[PDB]
Structures are given as structure tokens and as C-alpha cells.
């Protein structure tokens, strides 16, 4: 298992600062589920025993 290194941006000693800016939209993220409800079951007396 390896730690992938995030892009490293140096901090300039001078007052001016260096920043990294994205060039492409790269859309298409997705994927989520909540499991809001569960199945409802009622036990039957006499018949089960």
C-alpha cells in the first residue's frame, strides 16, 4: 500500500505567493445510498409454534 503524494506547492519567501489553478472541468462524480427503510414483518401466534 503506498501513499500517493499530492502535488507539492512551495511557499515563496517573497510577499508574492505561488498558487496551482485547474485547467479542465473533469465532471462526472456520483455514487450515494441511504437505506432509509427496512422490510416490515409481523409474527403469527399459535400457527408458528
Amino acid at each position: 500500500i503506498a501513499f500517493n503524494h499530492p502535488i507539492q506547492v512551495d511557499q515563496l519567501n517573497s510577499s508574492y505567493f505561488k498558487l496551482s489553478i485547474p485547467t479542465n472541468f473533469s465532471f462526472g462524480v456520483t455514487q450515494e445510498y441511504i437505506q432509509t427503510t427496512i422490510q416490515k414483518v409481523t409474527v403469527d401466534c399459535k400457527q408458528y409454534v
Partner: protein, 49 residues
């Protein structure tokens, strides 16, 4: 009238003489009344044997 072993919900008066009774065997509602040990139960839909 013949006597049969039966489970009966009995309402005992302050005088100590029962004026009301319920038999679980006769009717779906009577089984609901036997459940909760109460002559009157909350309104709703309840599963039956």
C-alpha cells in the same frame, strides 16, 4: 350450557363482582382485547392468528 377450559379477560368492579367479561377464542377483536389485558385498546390494524 357446557363448560370448556377457556382464557377469559375479566373486569373486576370496586364492589368486587365482575360485570364484564371477554373470551379470546370468539372473534378477532376479542383476541386484540385479551392482548394488552385491556377491554378498550388503541385504534389501528393488528395481525390475527
Amino acid at each position: 350450557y357446557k363448560l370448556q377450559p377457556l382464557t377469559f379477560l375479566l373486569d373486576f368492579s370496586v364492589d368486587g363482582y365482575i360485570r364484564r367479561a371477554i373470551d379470546c377464542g370468539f372473534n378477532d377483536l376479542s383476541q386484540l382485547h385479551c392482548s394488552y389485558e385491556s377491554f378498550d385498546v388503541e385504534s389501528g390494524v393488528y395481525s390475527v392468528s
